[PDB]
Structure 1
């Protein structure tokens, strides 16, 4: 399906906890949960 988007937002989580603002990574995590359940 959206495997491109999934890979990209996982990359975003990677870089985002490689940032310092460790919090939006987890938001994107629940977003991926939302994708998988839908």
Structure 2
């Protein structure tokens, strides 16, 4: 459902940042905002 993929997207945002892809992490951050604004 929606909660599983939200968690996997959150985890990829964190992993991207820890592995030195900060710019990519910020892009996934934007997706998390847009995704959670939906019904």
TM bin, normalised by shorter chain, reads 0.7 to 0.9
TM-score by length of 2: 0.80
Shift of 1:21: 1.6
CA distance in 2, matches of 1:17, 1:27: 11
User: TM-score by structure 1 length?
Assistant: 0.81
In structure 2, C-alpha distance between the alignment counterparts of 1:10 and 1:30, rounded to whole Å: 11
List gaps (5 residues or longer) in structure 2: none
- Residue 20 of structure 2 aligns with which residue? 20
SS of 1:29's partner is helix
